[PDB]
Amino acid sequence: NDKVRFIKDELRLLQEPGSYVGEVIKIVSDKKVLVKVQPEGKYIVDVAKDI
Amino acid sequence: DKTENDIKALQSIGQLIGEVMKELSEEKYIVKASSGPRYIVGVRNSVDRSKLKKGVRVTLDITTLTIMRILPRETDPLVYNMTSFEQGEITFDGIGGLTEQIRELREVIELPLKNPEIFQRVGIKPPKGVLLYGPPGTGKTLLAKAVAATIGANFIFSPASGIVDKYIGESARIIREMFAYAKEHEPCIIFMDEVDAIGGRRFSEGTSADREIQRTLMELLTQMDGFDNLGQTKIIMATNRPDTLDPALLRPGRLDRKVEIP
Amino acid sequence: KRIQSVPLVIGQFLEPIDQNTGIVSSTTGMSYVVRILSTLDRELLKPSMSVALHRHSNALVDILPPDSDSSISVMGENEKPDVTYADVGGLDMQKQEIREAVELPLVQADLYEQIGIDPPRGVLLYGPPGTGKTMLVKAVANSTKAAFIRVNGSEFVHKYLGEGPRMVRDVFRLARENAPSIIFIDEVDSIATKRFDAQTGSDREVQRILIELLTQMDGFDQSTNVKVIMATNRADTLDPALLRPGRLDRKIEFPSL
């Protein structure tokens, strides 16, 4: 039963459009963060509710 | 009907060109796209699977990303870095009164091109390189155009300075491509005018910007001496006076034939 | 299996962050943080790889071997030699010299071990090419069943600060994987001439290559599963650094009489 599940988890996990590596320029206290993304532009983005 | 055939021809969809980087298998290939990034692409149907080599130009599908066709190798224009004169401007007995020089160009250059077999059968090498020296237009230009006509070779004039790109391996690329094209479109004369903008003996062969010149000459010397050879590629050097040329070029196995124009 | 199928994009692996995270560079010029194989782990997986990525499912499908060939910054590879020694006559002395320098450490590790020496990483050949001298070199490559790697040492001679000096390291690395191999350096004396004076750009590069070879030779403990053959025609345009032994031990003469 576990084995069936393991293979399945890989099949889901490997389907992704990829996430961009970026650098926090500075922290904002409205729970936004400023990130200068390596290949993209610069964006101010909404930090995770749980982060 | 011509207008109706036209609309049919237009409904067709583009198809991206790449080069095979190296062949990974018999069903996986590594390609450096000439339209994109780096790709793994596969065989389609009834494809040539042992002819895809480094830097040959190939046709790939837009979405399928499999090998649709093979074209001849190209990586540099063929039409301006290589200026082509199919046959020669004049025949080789209409310039007559240069007859001695006609005679001894004819038996060195024409005969191994037409008949590689006699040189193979004896077991000697076909000739390598031939040199024209003397002022230009003593009928110098005539003799070079004229040997090509009779063979029905293409005469290909290469400007030596243009072989001086300031980028990585561009310089490597250009020489190689002429040599590759010489074998595809055979017989052919690759005529390299002036061998003191890519060769010569320089100031003293130190570094002042005399390494660009040193890279160019090194390339010529490595292909000739090495495993590569000249057979249905004949290379012809031209120089105002012959004493100005590196002594490596003066060795046999680069230039065996050295004709004078008095 | 059915999903993880050709056609794939090639990108390059930088490092594995942890297990099922790796950072990858796609050869689009976009980089991503992705998950990695669960077929490999961290003991089956090296940090620097050429890798196969999914085109739209951007993840580690497969690993490739490192690769270095490209149409920028070209390198010559010649696989399957076809030349076997004594092409030209009167190289009797020279046939024996090369044989014990280049051929012998690759085929027999074991004799260097017992005498208690470490195998010479370099040989210097002085003389004209293409008289009999090149012919012998190509013959050793055949006999050892080694890839012949032809380097024109003025080819990086590239006019950028960037790509070419990087490549040369990668070429030697690619040679060690596919051991044994011959790195055969046309006119190493070209790039044994270096700046001494203000010349700004367009003369800067010969310094970069020279330094690259030097760092490697002196920086690492001896081994030979890969031999470096230097070929030289101007013997005074060298620099002493090269010629220092404990690494470059063999100086083979080509005879002229």
Binding site: - | D6, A9, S12, G14, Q15, S34, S35, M68, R69, E74 | -
Partner: protein, 45 residues
């Protein structure tokens, strides 16, 4: 539809041309009766 992307030409077999688009992509395409192979060159729209 106006506009069209321009191109230069690097191959002029019998029905084929390769065009290099101002979008830095080379394609293998066929030719039609509204092109002549005599107006397929670098330095033309």
């Amino acid at each position: 539809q106006l506009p069209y992307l321009v191109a230069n030409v690097v191959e002029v077999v019998g029905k084929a041309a390769v065009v290099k688009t101002s979008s830095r992509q080379t394609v293998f395409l066929p030719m039609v009766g509204l092109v002549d192979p005599d107006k397929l060159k670098p330095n033309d729209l």
